[PDB]
Amino acid sequence: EATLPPGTPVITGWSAVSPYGIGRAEFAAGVRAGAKTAVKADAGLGPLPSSDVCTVPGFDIQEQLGPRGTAKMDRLTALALVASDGLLLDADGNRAVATDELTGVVLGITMGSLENVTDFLRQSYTNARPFYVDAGRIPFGSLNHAAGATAIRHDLKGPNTTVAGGRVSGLLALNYARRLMGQGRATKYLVGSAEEFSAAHAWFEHTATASGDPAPLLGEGCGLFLVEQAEAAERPPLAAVLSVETRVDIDDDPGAAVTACARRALRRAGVDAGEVWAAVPCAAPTAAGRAEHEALAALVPADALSRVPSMELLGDTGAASASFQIAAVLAAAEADADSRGRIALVCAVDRDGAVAVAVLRLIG
Amino acid sequence: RRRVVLTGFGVISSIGTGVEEYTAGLRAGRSGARPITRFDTEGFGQNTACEVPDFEPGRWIHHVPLDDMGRAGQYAVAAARMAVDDAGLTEDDLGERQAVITVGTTDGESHDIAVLLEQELAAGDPEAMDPVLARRINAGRLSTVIARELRMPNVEATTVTTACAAGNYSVGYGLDSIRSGEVDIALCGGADAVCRKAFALFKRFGALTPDVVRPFDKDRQGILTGEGAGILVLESLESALARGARIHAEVLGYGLSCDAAHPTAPNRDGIARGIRLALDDAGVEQEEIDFISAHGTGTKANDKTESAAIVDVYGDAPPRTVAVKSMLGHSMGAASALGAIACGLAIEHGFIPPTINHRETDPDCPLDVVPNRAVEADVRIVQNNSSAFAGNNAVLILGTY
């Protein structure tokens, strides 16, 4: 708290909509319990490469967000919006976080709503003319739509960014926020990442899988953080973001890239690897995921890996991954005095070659 | 605060490839409009876009297999190669540097997504889809392949998906990243590829021109979809000076605003806020702006709103306000990056590129749009505007070094 460099970002709040349910509480409960989330996929999604899915249970867009502008709303946007409400509002819909025009928004994604874009293109191919699409779905298609919708919803006129990157996107987002806040472009930031479950996503993932491998267990949801400057923080810090480092695995040695990335992140945080109390890999069901796990299992105290349940319990949550990882750390840390001042490390690897690592100091 | 300069430009565009070809196109009022080849235009009643005509990936791409990228990725990588070439930077100089690579995009490999669906639709079977396509459709890849091609592992590769504003967001992020001191170099820009998704989207919006793009024209009828890539090398002044680098222009500042109003419609207040933020970041007065490179898409809504915002900020004598998309068409994620480069080149070469296809200025856009012909000027400071869906505005201010 008092030990922190000047202008260190702090997370002062979080929210999640996840395969554990809607809300931070459900996420925290699921993480602490190391609960399973896989269910049999709803018949409505049509044929899927696998029947088993980690969807958000009890998630209905109109039920959550009401009737206005929700009929054609993509699930990705819906998840982000519900998460935004958990972050900025309390359980009674009171305003928990004071936002203004210097409140930034940055959301990480993989490739937006593939459900939207694939529905649009299916219509384009199969309807009377190739621009005879569901025109009401078009606003929702933009990759930046979830971030933009969040801003419309909460009147956030400040910086509004969407970054891609898949599993690393939450960390790219975090680093982006960190840098912009560092430059005075925002005093507070809503940072996070999101991935919807869609038949399109599921089929594309299956297609992209290293031929032979089983259809991945896929999850979905959104995790969001309220980030502030430690000096100016208007709510108690839960964690300080000490460093976020990234690399690209250009030599197809994801282990080596994870190792290099983590060591750099730890150096830049000014901490030793032995100080890591919780280490949360993304657990991607890929060679890179396995390599990441092996790399961290060597790099950090073994006890740091047993501290938080495997992210595998949520399935491959795609872009949501790193945000769920950070949230799992915060969930593990909350209501456990043992976590105070401890270092946490979150690591993710993405198919498209990116590696990212964040080092946090747990406060409370 | 650390000063940041543009030491390299890479350009793949509908009006020219490379800094030379592109400076020529801009000065010429070249129009990049040509028939669409990338996909089947049957049924659209219309088949013009601003494609890159004669792209040869082999000129630029050495290391990354072409099938690892769709077209947008190829453009990104080619422009990146060109840009680092243009900066006097080799893969050897780059491997050593912690860097940011930030590529903006609207649609990414949405063409590949369409082809994937075609495969499923032809076969009536999801299992007909090509793994090679499905592996390369995610936008994050646009940034990471550059790192791959230039052999730069020590990179933050961030694709910014803020659509038409994404190039300016990316340059701004480079600026912030260098200003922070954490990196001395950033490859920033944007890339997109013509696709059926974008064509059909704008068609269905009634935002496609039936002939040509006429920004700020009284009878403007919309856009043409475009593509390409612009990559800018940003460098700390320290690092540029110390390296003997030719400096094209200086990055002074940018501004980001969000309209927080409408998912697709532009917002006057939102654009105006972005401009004002950019001027404040740049440390620059309305007076000192030589011209605005307008978002200027050529749609009814955009041009009247953007004009209004400009007039709000500058008063009723705003600077000359030109629309590069008159020539490029709307190159989506590349648009603001290609605009930025045009702005830097305008600074460097003392010209203001034209708003072409200009018959008659909309009376509600009371601007000097530098119609149809480039003019000479003592261009020292330039504003590059960009607005996108989801109310995302980004305004970039460049200056003479």
The two structure tokens encoding residue B309: 């915002």
Measure Cα distances from B288 to B281, B285, B291, B382 in Å: 14, 6, 9, 9
Which residues in chain A have Cβ-Cβ distances shorter than 8 Å to B281? 185
Q: Rounded distance, CA B315 to CA B323, Å?
A: 20
Q: Rounded distance, CA B134 to CA B137, Å?
A: 6
Sequence-separated (6 or more) residues with CB below 8 Å from residue B105: A143, A164, B72, B139, B142, B159, B160, B161, B163, B166, B190, B191, B192, B332, B333
Tell how strand B16-17 and strand B48-49 pair up: unpaired
Q: Rounded distance, CA A266 to CA A162, Å?
A: 27
Q: How many CA atoms lie within 13 A of A122 on its CB side?
A: 12
Give A293-353 as a DSSP string.
HHHHHHHS-HHHHHSS--GGGG-B-GGGHHHHHHHHHHHHHTT-GGGTT-EEEEEEE-TTS
Per the CB < 8 A criterion, the answer to whether B388 and B166 are in contact is: yes
B204 shares its domain with B145: yes
Q: Is the dihedral of CA A286, A287, A290, A292 positive or negative?
A: negative
Sequence-separated (6 or more) residues with CB below 8 Å from residue A128: none
Measure Cα distances from A254 to A210, A278, A340, A353, B268 in Å: 16, 21, 31, 8, 47
**B248 labelled catalytic:** no
Sequence-separated (6 or more) residues with CB below 8 Å from residue A58: A21, A22
Instruction: Count residue pairs from A and B with Cβ separation < 8 A.
Output: 249
Give A185-202 as a DSSP string.
S-SEEEEEEEE---HHHH
Per the CB < 8 A criterion, the answer to whether B134 and A209 are in contact is: no
Radius of gyration, CA atoms only, chain B: 19
The two structure tokens encoding residue A201: 């996503």
B200 shares its domain with B299: no
Q: Is A253 exposed, middle or buried (0-12, 13-18, 19+ CB in 10 A)?
A: middle
To 5 degrees, how large is the angle CA A116–CA A349–CA A15? 60
Q: Rounded distance, CA A68 to CA A66, Å?
A: 6
Best probe of the A interface among B64, B156, B170, by most A CBs < 10 A, is B156
- Domain end: B255, B270, B293, which one? B255
Give B180-243 as a DSSP string.
TTS-SEEEEEEEE---HHHHHHHHHTT-B-SS---TTBTT---B-BB-EEEEEEEEEHHHHHHH
Per the CB < 8 A criterion, the answer to whether A83 and A224 are in contact is: yes
B222 shares its domain with B294: no
Sequence-separated (6 or more) residues with CB below 8 Å from residue B226: B14, B32, B49, B50, B51, B192, B194, B325, B328, B329, B330, B331, B332, B334, B335
Give strand pairing partners of B231.
Answer: B10, B189
Helix axes A169-182, A321-333, angle to 10 degrees: 80
In chain A, the residue whose alpha carbon lies closest to the alpha carbon of B113 is: A118
Q: Is the dihedral of CA B22, B26, B27, B32 positive or negative?
A: positive
B248 shares its domain with B367: no
Q: Is A213 on the interface with B (CB under 8 A)?
A: no
Per the CB < 8 A criterion, the answer to whether B354 and B370 are in contact is: yes
Return the percent helix, strand and coil in chain B, to nearest 5. 40, 20, 40
**B164 labelled catalytic:** yes
Per the CB < 8 A criterion, the answer to whether B280 and B197 are in contact is: no
- Residue B150's SS3 state is helix
Q: Which of B50, B111, B188, B330 is catalytic?
A: B330
Give strand pairing partners of B4.
Answer: B236, B251
Q: Rounded distance, CA B384 to CA B252, Å?
A: 12
* Best CA proximity match to B278, nearest among B312, B313, B253, B243: B253
Q: Residue B59's CB: how many other CB atoms inside 10 A?
A: 12
**Helices and strands, number each (H, E), in chain A:** 12, 13
Measure Cα distances from A123 to A13, B130, B247 in Å: 41, 21, 49
The residue assigned the tokens 């998704």 is B197
Measure Cα distances from B361 to A44, A347, B368, B386 in Å: 52, 54, 8, 21
B306 shares its domain with B284: yes
Per the CB < 8 A criterion, the answer to whether A248 and B155 are in contact is: yes
Per the CB < 8 A criterion, the answer to whether A317 and A54 are in contact is: yes
CB interface of A with B, residues 102-131, below 8 Å:
105, 109-112, 114, 117-118, 120-122, 124-126, 129-131
Nearest to A157 among B108, B273, B388 (CB): B273
Q: Rounded distance, CA B205 to CA B109, Å?
A: 21
Per the CB < 8 A criterion, the answer to whether B232 and B340 are in contact is: yes
Which residues in chain A have Cβ-Cβ distances shorter than 8 Å to B91? none
In chain A, the residue whose alpha carbon lies closest to the alpha carbon of B388 is: A144
Which residues in chain B have Cβ-Cβ distances shorter than 8 Å to A45? none
Q: Rounded distance, CA B49 to CA B36, Å?
A: 6
Q: What is the resolution of this structure in A?
A: 1.8
Q: Which contacts of B124-129 are long-range, i.e. CB under 8 A and separated by 24 or more positions?
A: B126/A47, B126/A49, B126/A203, B126/A206, B126/A207, B129/A203, B129/A204, B129/A207
Per the CB < 8 A criterion, the answer to whether B323 and B355 are in contact is: yes
Sequence-separated (6 or more) residues with CB below 8 Å from residue A224: A14, A15, A16, A80, A83, A84, A86, A87, A190, A191, A192, A323
Q: Rounded distance, CA B253 to CA B255, Å?
A: 7
Q: Rounded distance, CA B350 to CA B368, Å?
A: 17
Q: Is A75 exposed, middle or buried (0-12, 13-18, 19+ CB in 10 A)?
A: buried
- Residue A284's SS3 state is coil
Helix axes B141-150, B71-87, angle to 10 degrees: 40
Tell how strand B16-17 and strand B4-13 pair up: antiparallel
Structural domain boundaries of chain A?
Answer: 1-364
Q: Rounded distance, CA B383 to CA B238, Å?
A: 24
Continuous segment of H or E residues that includes residue B116: helix B110-123
Are B152 and A250 within 8 A, CB to CB? Answer: yes
- Residue A110's SS3 state is coil
Per the CB < 8 A criterion, the answer to whether A314 and A37 are in contact is: yes
To 5 degrees, how large is the angle CA B349–CA B350–CA B356? 95
Per the CB < 8 A criterion, the answer to whether B224 and B48 are in contact is: yes
Sequence-separated (6 or more) residues with CB below 8 Å from residue A186: A102, A103, A104, A158, A159, A177, A180
Per the CB < 8 A criterion, the answer to whether A349 and A355 are in contact is: yes
Phi first, then psi, for residue A204 (nearest 5°) are -65, -40
Does any domain span residue B18? yes
To 5 degrees, how large is the angle CA B327–CA B330–CA B335? 95
Per the CB < 8 A criterion, the answer to whether B42 and B31 are in contact is: no
Strands (DSSP E) found in chain A:
9-18, 21-22, 39-40, 52-54, 103-108, 160-163, 188-195, 218-219, 221-229, 239-248, 276-280, 343-349, 354-362
Per the CB < 8 A criterion, the answer to whether A110 and A169 are in contact is: yes
B29 shares its domain with B149: yes
Q: Rounded distance, CA B211 to CA B218, Å?
A: 15
Number of independent structural domains in chain B: 2
**DSSP 8-state assignment for residue A135:** G
Radius of gyration, CA atoms only, chain A: 19
B295 shares its domain with B220: no
The two structure tokens encoding residue B245: 């680098």
Q: Is B211 exposed, middle or buried (0-12, 13-18, 19+ CB in 10 A)?
A: exposed
Q: Rounded distance, CA B123 to CA B58, Å?
A: 33
**B358 labelled catalytic:** no
Per the CB < 8 A criterion, the answer to whether A136 and B264 are in contact is: no
* Best CA proximity match to A238, nearest among A8, A10, A43, A4: A10
Which residues in chain A have Cβ-Cβ distances shorter than 8 Å to B137? 111, 204
- What b/e readout covers B214-237, taking b as 16+ CB neighbours within 10 angstroms? bbbbeebbbbbbbbbbbbbbbbbb
B190 shares its domain with B269: no
* Best CA proximity match to A191, nearest among A227, A243, A145: A227
B296 shares its domain with B221: no
B338 shares its domain with B358: yes
The residue assigned the tokens 């009828």 is B221
Elucidation method: X-ray
Domain that holds residue B33: 6-255
Per the CB < 8 A criterion, the answer to whether B193 and B69 are in contact is: no
Q: Rounded distance, CA A118 to CA B119, Å?
A: 13
In chain B, the residue whose alpha carbon lies closest to the alpha carbon of A113 is: B138
Which residues in chain A have Cβ-Cβ distances shorter than 8 Å to B199? 131
Nearest to A248 among B139, B148, B161 (CB): B148
Which residues in chain B have Cβ-Cβ distances shorter than 8 Å to A117? 110, 113, 197
Are A175 and B44 within 8 A, CB to CB? Answer: no
Q: How many CA atoms lie within 13 A of B142 on its CB side?
A: 42
- Domain end: B255, B275, B298, which one? B255
B288 shares its domain with B251: no
Tell me which amino acid residue B9 is: F
- Residue A355's SS3 state is strand
Give A163-188 as a DSSP string.
E--GGGHHHHHHHHHHHHHHTTS-SE
The two structure tokens encoding residue B70: 């769709």
B242 shares its domain with B332: no
* Best CA proximity match to A177, nearest among A241, A133, A261: A241
**DSSP 8-state assignment for residue A99:** -
In chain B, the residue whose alpha carbon lies closest to the alpha carbon of A318 is: B138
The two structure tokens encoding residue B228: 């390409």
Q: Is A251 on the interface with B (CB under 8 A)?
A: yes
The two structure tokens encoding residue A341: 């001042």
Does any domain span residue B1? no
